[PDB]
Amino acid sequence: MNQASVVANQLIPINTMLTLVMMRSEVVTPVGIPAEDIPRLVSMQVNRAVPLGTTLMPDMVKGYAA
């Protein structure tokens, strides 16, 4: 298994605008937002709290479509 997902590098509070320090790339299951999309996620808002080590999923990011 090779596909990496975006994983929270810190707790991300509800309604926070994402910054690069908050997002790492990890091979996790289930698969979330592809790691290659990190640059596109900067300044987008999360619609819930994302604990440290949580996989970022498309439904957690306001305005995200792929």
Residue numbers in the entry: 0 to 65
Question: What do the paper's sentences say?
Answer:
pmcIn the manuscript published in IUCrJ under the title ‘Modeling a unit cell: crystallographic refinement procedure using the biomolecular MD simulation platform Amber’, the authors described the results of the refinement of 84 protein structures using a novel approach that utilizes molecular dynamics and the maximum-likelihood potential that encodes the structure-factor based restraints. In our opinion, the only example for which the re-refined structure was deposited in the Protein Data Bank (PDB) does not provide convincing proof for the superiority of this refinement method.
The structure was originally refined at 1.9 Å resolution, but it appears that the refinement was not finalized. In particular, the deposited coordinates lacked any solvent that should have been visible at this resolution, thus despite good validation statistics, that structure has to be considered of uncertain quality. In the procedure used by Mikhailovskii et al., the original unit cell that contained a single protein molecule in the asymmetric unit in the space group P212121 was expanded to P1 with identical unit-cell parameters, but containing four independent molecules. Thus, the number of refinable parameters was significantly increased, though the amount of available diffraction data remained the same. Their re-refined structure consisted of 1952 protein atoms and 155 water molecules. Waters were added automatically in Coot on the basis of 3.5σ peaks in the Fo − Fc electron density map. The process took less than an hour of human time and negligible computing time on a standard PC. However, if more parameters do not lead to better agreement, the strict Ockham razor should be mercilessly applied to avoid unnecessary complication of the problem. It is clear that, at least in this case, the complicated procedure involving molecular dynamics did not work any better than manual refitting and standard crystallographic refinement.
